[PDB]
Write a protein that binds this ligand. Structure first.
Ligand SMILES: [Cl-]
Ligand SMILES: [Cl-]
Ligand SMILES: [Cu+2]
Ligand SMILES: [Zn+2]
Length: 146
């Protein structure tokens, strides 16, 4: 098993610790943790390309989708849901991201957005790029667990 952590920080109050674990080099990745400082609602949650306003991590050159869509970016992890006091519990199992190999998400940037991801079902081309999720509230590099 390979383990990773991203520490989400932003310019506002949004912060959190997100864990990743992958038992087999080609097995599903479990993603979990809590994000605080939000407001009640749905917020886009993706792996972005940045390592060093960049696009979603997309090594296979696909269009944007929800996590369970046949057409999606590798980074497309959908939405997290925060309650009235601004806490979202993240618990995701994903088959497309990986922590090893040619397309490993290690070193890329995890992002939580200001608004909801429309899962590529929106009425414009932007929907097929970013899900119309808007600006970033918090981000953090995905690093191998120390
Ligand atoms: Cl980016
Ligand atoms: Cl907005
Ligand atoms: Cu995003
Ligand atoms: Zn995407």
């Amino acid at each position: 098993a390979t383990k990773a952590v991203a520490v989400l920080k932003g310019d506002g109050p949004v912060q959190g610790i997100i864990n990743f674990e992958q038992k087999e080099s080609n097995g599903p990745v479990k993603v979990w943790g809590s994000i605080k400082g939000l407001t009640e609602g749905l917020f886009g949650f993706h792996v972005h390309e940045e390592e060093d306003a960049g696009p979603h991590f997309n090594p296979l050159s696909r269009k944007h989708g929800g996590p369970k869509d046949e057409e999606r970016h590798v980074g497309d992890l959908g939405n997290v849901t925060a309650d009235k006091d601004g806490v979202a519990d993240v618990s995701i199992e994903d088959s497309v991201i990986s922590l090893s190999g040619d397309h490993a998400i290690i070193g890329r940037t995890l992002v939580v957005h200001e608004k909801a991801d429309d899962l590529g079902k929106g009425g414009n081309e932007e929907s097929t790029k970013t899900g119309n999720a808007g600006s970033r509230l918090a981000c953090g590099v995905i690093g191998i667990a120390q």
